[PDB]
Amino acid sequence: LRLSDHLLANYKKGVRPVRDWRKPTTVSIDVIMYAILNVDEKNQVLTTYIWYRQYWTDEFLQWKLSIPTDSIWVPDILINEFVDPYVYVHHRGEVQNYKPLQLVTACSLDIYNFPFDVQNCSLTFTSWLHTIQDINITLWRSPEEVRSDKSIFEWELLEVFPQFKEFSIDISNSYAEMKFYVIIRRRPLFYAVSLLLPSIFLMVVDIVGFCLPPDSGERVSFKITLLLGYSVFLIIVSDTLPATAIGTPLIGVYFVVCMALLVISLAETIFIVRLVHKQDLQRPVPDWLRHLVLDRIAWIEVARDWLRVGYVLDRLLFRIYLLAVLAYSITLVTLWSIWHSS
Amino acid sequence: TQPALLRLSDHLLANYKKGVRPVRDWRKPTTVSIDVIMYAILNVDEKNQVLTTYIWYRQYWTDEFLQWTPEDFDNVTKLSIPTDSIWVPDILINEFVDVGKSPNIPYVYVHHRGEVQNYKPLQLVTACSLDIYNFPFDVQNCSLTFTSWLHTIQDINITLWRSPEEVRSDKSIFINQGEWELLEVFPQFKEFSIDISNSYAEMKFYVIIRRRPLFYAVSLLLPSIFLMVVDIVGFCLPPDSGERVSFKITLLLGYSVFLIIVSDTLPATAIGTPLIGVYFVVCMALLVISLAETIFIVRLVHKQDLQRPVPDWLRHLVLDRIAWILVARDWLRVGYVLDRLLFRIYLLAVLAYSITLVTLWSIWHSS
Amino acid sequence: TQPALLRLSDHLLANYKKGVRPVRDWRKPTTVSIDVIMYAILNVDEKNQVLTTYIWYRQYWTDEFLQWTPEDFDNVTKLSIPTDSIWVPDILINEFVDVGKSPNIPYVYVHHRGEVQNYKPLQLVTACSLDIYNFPFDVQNCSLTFTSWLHTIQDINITLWRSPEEVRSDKSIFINQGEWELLEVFPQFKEFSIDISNSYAEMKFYVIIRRRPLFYAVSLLLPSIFLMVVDIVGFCLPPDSGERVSFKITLLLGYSVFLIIVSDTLPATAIGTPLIGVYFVVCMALLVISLAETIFIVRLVHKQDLQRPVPDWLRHLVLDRIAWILVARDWLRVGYVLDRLLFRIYLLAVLAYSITLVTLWSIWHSS
Amino acid sequence: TQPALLRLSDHLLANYKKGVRPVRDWRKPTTVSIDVIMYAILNVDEKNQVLTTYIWYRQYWTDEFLQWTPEDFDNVTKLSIPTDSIWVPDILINEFVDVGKSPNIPYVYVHHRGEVQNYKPLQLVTACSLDIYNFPFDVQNCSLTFTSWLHTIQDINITLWRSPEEVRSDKSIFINQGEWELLEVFPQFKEFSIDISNSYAEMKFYVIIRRRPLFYAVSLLLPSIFLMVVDIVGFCLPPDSGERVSFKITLLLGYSVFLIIVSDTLPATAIGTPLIGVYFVVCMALLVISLAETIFIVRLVHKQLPVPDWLRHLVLDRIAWILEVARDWLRVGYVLDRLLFRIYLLAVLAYSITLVTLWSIWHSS
Numbered sequence A: 001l002r003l004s005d006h007l008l009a010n011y012k013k014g015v016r017p018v019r020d021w022r023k024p025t026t027v028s029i030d031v032i033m034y035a036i037l038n039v040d041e042k043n044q045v046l047t048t049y050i051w052y053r054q055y056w057t058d059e060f061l062q063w064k065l066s067i068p069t070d071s072i073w074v075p076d077i078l079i080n081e082f083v084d085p086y087v088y089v090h091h092r093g094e095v096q097n098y099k100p101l102q103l104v105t106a107c108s109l110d111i112y113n114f115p116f117d118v119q120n121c122s123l124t125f126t127s128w129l130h131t132i133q134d135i136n137i138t139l140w141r142s143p144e145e146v147r148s149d150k151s152i153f154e155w156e157l158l159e160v161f162p163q164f165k166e167f168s169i170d171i172s173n174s175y176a177e178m179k180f181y182v183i184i185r186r187r188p189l190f191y192a193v194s195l196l197l198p199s200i201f202l203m204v205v206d207i208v209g210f211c212l213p214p215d216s217g218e219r220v221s222f223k224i225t226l227l228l229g230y231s232v233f234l235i236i237v238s239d240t241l242p243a244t245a246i247g248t249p250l251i252g253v254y255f256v257v258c259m260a261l262l263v264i265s266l267a268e269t270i271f272i273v274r275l276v277h278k279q280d281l282q283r284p285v286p287d288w289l290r291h292l293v294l295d296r297i298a299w300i301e302v303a304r305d306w307l308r309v310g311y312v313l314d315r316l317l318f319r320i321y322l323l324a325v326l327a328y329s330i331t332l333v334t335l336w337s338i339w340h341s342s
Numbered sequence B, C: 001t002q003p004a005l006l007r008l009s010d011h012l013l014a015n016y017k018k019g020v021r022p023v024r025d026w027r028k029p030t031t032v033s034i035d036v037i038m039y040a041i042l043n044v045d046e047k048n049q050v051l052t053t054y055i056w057y058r059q060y061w062t063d064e065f066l067q068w069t070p071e072d073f074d075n076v077t078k079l080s081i082p083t084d085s086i087w088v089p090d091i092l093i094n095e096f097v098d099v100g101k102s103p104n105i106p107y108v109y110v111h112h113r114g115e116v117q118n119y120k121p122l123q124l125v126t127a128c129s130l131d132i133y134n135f136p137f138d139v140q141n142c143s144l145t146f147t148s149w150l151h152t153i154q155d156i157n158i159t160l161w162r163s164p165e166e167v168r169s170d171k172s173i174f175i176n177q178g179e180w181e182l183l184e185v186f187p188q189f190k191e192f193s194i195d196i197s198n199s200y201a202e203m204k205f206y207v208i209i210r211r212r213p214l215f216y217a218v219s220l221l222l223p224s225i226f227l228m229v230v231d232i233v234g235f236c237l238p239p240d241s242g243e244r245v246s247f248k249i250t251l252l253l254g255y256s257v258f259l260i261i262v263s264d265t266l267p268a269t270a271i272g273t274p275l276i277g278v279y280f281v282v283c284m285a286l287l288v289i290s291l292a293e294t295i296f297i298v299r300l301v302h303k304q305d306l307q308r309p310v311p312d313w314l315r316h317l318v319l320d321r322i323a324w325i326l327v328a329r330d331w332l333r334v335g336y337v338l339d340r341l342l343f344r345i346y347l348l349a350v351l352a353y354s355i356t357l358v359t360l361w362s363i364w365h366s367s
Numbered sequence D: 001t002q003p004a005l006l007r008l009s010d011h012l013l014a015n016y017k018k019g020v021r022p023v024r025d026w027r028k029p030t031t032v033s034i035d036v037i038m039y040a041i042l043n044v045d046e047k048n049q050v051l052t053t054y055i056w057y058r059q060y061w062t063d064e065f066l067q068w069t070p071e072d073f074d075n076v077t078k079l080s081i082p083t084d085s086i087w088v089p090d091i092l093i094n095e096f097v098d099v100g101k102s103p104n105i106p107y108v109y110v111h112h113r114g115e116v117q118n119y120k121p122l123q124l125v126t127a128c129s130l131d132i133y134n135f136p137f138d139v140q141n142c143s144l145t146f147t148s149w150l151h152t153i154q155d156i157n158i159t160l161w162r163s164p165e166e167v168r169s170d171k172s173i174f175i176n177q178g179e180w181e182l183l184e185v186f187p188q189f190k191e192f193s194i195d196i197s198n199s200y201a202e203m204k205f206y207v208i209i210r211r212r213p214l215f216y217a218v219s220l221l222l223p224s225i226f227l228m229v230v231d232i233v234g235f236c237l238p239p240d241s242g243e244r245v246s247f248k249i250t251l252l253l254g255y256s257v258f259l260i261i262v263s264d265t266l267p268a269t270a271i272g273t274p275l276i277g278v279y280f281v282v283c284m285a286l287l288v289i290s291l292a293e294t295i296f297i298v299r300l301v302h303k304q305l306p307v308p309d310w311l312r313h314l315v316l317d318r319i320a321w322i323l324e325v326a327r328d329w330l331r332v333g334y335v336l337d338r339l340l341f342r343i344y345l346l347a348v349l350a351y352s353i354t355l356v357t358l359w360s361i362w363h364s365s
Ligand SMILES: NCCc1c[nH]c2ccc(O)cc12
Pocket: B093, B094, B147, B148, B149, B150, B194, B200, C037, C055, C056, C057, C058, C119, C120, C121
């Protein structure tokens, strides 16, 4: 009890421990990651669980002692991109600080590879107000060699490595910047089942629908039901994939491409249904665009007028849709290869 | 005591009282200089109220009790002492709904002439006016006001550390990510007085903000126009006694899904739904009317039913409305002419929808 | 000489002991006038029955130790004593389930006669009843009980700064743009006694609020009405025709999705579900029953599976039904009477839904 | 002259020092009565294994240094002393995780015989083992232990202000319209000792909370059973080789939306998913299998190949006993579709049975 009274008398919080104020103090911090947490995909902020572990170098306190955090000085080393009591002090001249934190740090998020995304984010360390001409953050050891190889970890933590430069930080002329880039990976299984699994069947059922007779009215009902299916799947699209200034990911483009393609197919099918003997109306073609289109096809009552053109247009659209499906498959293969590479 | 930093700090904080305002004459109000630099507007979340933002905040007021003269002390020109030892003005936001989670930092700089610098980040959450009538092409005008919560004008006064024209166009450190882009910050100085004649000092920072609708356009708009163009052929291309019974209900369910999608991302507000939602409701009503028409004039009601006398004065109307616009046979003719009328109404509705989307885009771009 | 403020603050705070109730006679209670201004209703959580609201709170008590003659201290009649340096009473809301992220105001005005004014913004997370039987046309009242945690009437007595009418009809700074509209704030003071000699002062503010249902009406009421209307009008199709089968199938798919998201959207409390959830699940059951009727119809005529069996239950039940409403052929007649019965049931259900909506709106608008 | 309250407070705290046990004698201990009243169960995070409550915790210890004759201080028989100027028992919670944000009450009465009372609201966050295997019909049993911390009895003897019967039915102030229903608060007294030399004193405020399933009845159970019935009637209605693939994929999309809602509603634990997530996943798997088989059969029949004959013998012998070369393919597709329908009916029967069994266990409490 009386030990604290003696030590607290000859100590001031506001002053830096220095023999002379010209000499700059040295502060060391080692960042410990654990249990990576949810990342808000909106490209605004990500939340992670961290351990601080700050080590000091020189203090004018000499005589294990436990003291409240308000009885010893703690430097205001914080994070530049940052949003949202017992002290382990030794009599030899070293102090230890134990406190868990959540960064909830703002960063730049990449969605263009959803859901197989391996994005990079930074953890910059500095002091918000200190000029840091005397409290530089030169570290005790280099975390590059030791931290990178192994760590103690819906998201996967992959690699955290440091990087330093002298002059930086925009709040003031701050000498403290030891950036901690963070690499994370996402579990895609739930996202795969929720998005890719129902969508890929929406690519193969439409192929099956092309086997139906184009002139038959049953294909119209099939396309109507698939249009309702895309209407329903739009809810999944809106709920699952996030919003970003870059827009929808590379997967989201193919969804609207296939929806537009099926809309065009349905419109063509309905037009052919009208123009075949169901309604016909002896409607003639100008015979100019007809022969032009026939010449284009040449390289890779009222029956032949409409049935042939409808069939060839349906075959062309089926080829286009199969090409779109192949592009989708290639995109997923490439995304999975690049994500599993990391 | 050889470094004498302890001596300097204890000399400045010897007879200093934190609670007393630092003025030699009590009749002179203390003037606070405010600098606000935007960082992000992350997590706008619900659009009924609330606006989350991150700013970098500064304060510059002169303390007359910390005017220690140099050339006799350690010859320093800059001292840092904890914020818990000096008087700090009670500057607060009127819309200060949530304090948020921000690191409260000590050690405000104190100059050798007494000037105090109070750099501090603020993770603000404020309540402002959010008009979603033009969604997704939305531009919002939210206020970040700063005022003394309890001190009056003759106690605390508010000024700007830099001229307003510098504040408007100094979005330097702002990160240009997320769905929202900051356009303008407008500082204005309007006094505050609610009940009695104790004049307050209030400064308004009008944060003009803009939304990027690219994702929203791709996700919600382009499918909507696809359903419009499906309806346009659907009214005229499929004839009666066909698949129209399933067609109209399927597109009606699609429009209902569109209303659902608009609803989930847009919270309840004094305005019911944006203009796009109003047009979706109108198209749903038109589809209901078309379905009622088809069922009532085709199939079991009229096509299968026989010897049902249908008179009325509508045949007198079609002798004139068909000129203005341009029992089985009678039923087919009346169904066809009313279907053409519904075609014209829906074509007008789609034209109005496209025109209003163009108008909203023009307003959003010309902001 | 010393500044006027420093001398006055030293004179007031010398030999001043907080934690002692500032009265020169301990037998007279300290009257703490209370005034509350409602600023915003941040959130009304029916899940946890907690009301999140933001109010501007003012206190008013007389400290008999902080009295000074204005003739001295250079004619000063007001000060800024820190809050944590004097006696501040123990009034707090009994309904707290969370303190809230309310900023602290470290200053008060002490007048030259001892009158102390406390201004602070309170972010309240308080428990309520939150009956959702009338959703969306929902009117709810919440109490804000201000009483001292452990001070009786003989120690602390709570009154109103303003007259009850002024508190009731304030509507000054409230944000009239959210989901909830503030109807009134009803203050009334009742002495609360746990026993015969431990009466406690208590002030109750009744925050009566009213939801804005236009958004919910457009999002939920219009689609959920159009869908049942088209379901009614689709019974005009022949019961035995296969065109109704696809109609029923796709209507089932769309309406099932619609109800999935609706049931996700609707709130739920301990009492159960709103009055419209009953009609929604009733329509669920009715649509399932209609599809089962189609199942029975299709198997009769699509194949020869049901042609061989004959009705063993006879027409007695069917005869009673046709009296109440007013081999194949027999099965088709059974299908027709069941279809007519389901038509009556749908008509009754939709009529009841419309009457319920009208009654809910009339209750909501009247009060 | 001097105010009675001011003079009395000056006299009481002049010789008083915080940190020393108020009992003048060095032998007999300091009894500390306790009275805990539950107000609300704010949050139960099963993933983090933290129980967030809100109690009204009261202490009644008879201080000995705060004794005064009323006749000497203008008949003041009761005084309000700041809680930071006198000794207060250091009773903490053994299951402590976080203290939360609770209002600060800085006053405590002392009577003319030194009878201090300390009422305080606590937004406690405690760690208790939570099992969600019976969601939403789950009954939890979370402890609440108040310990002596520094003192090792014969200094502080924690006792109850009221008998366990009074504290058991503390529903006079509870907000009983939330998700969790407070069943009982049963206190248990037991002494634990680090060493045989001396023992500690503690209480065990067993708090049993039962979840109200009516919150999720319309959100999960009714939509789930509606989708089960819809899947059944969608197996029944369309022909197996007919125009069903479009309807089946629309149904699959709807049920995937339902699973999105479920994942946004159900809670997650390190133990695993509740008993209904298994049924949801099983129904998804069977629906996907049915859609894939129907797609395969329709593709083969529209291909126009007759039978592999490595399975026809077993299908006729075994698979057929569930109860034009493409015609045999259509028949075997129909047989497998009927088998899948029977499997789905068995699965929905199991789902219906387990819900009543879970409800009965929940109702048994
Ligand atoms: N910035 C608000 C200052 C203010 C002026 N009048 C008030 C009345 C109550 C209150 O809490 C605050 C105020």
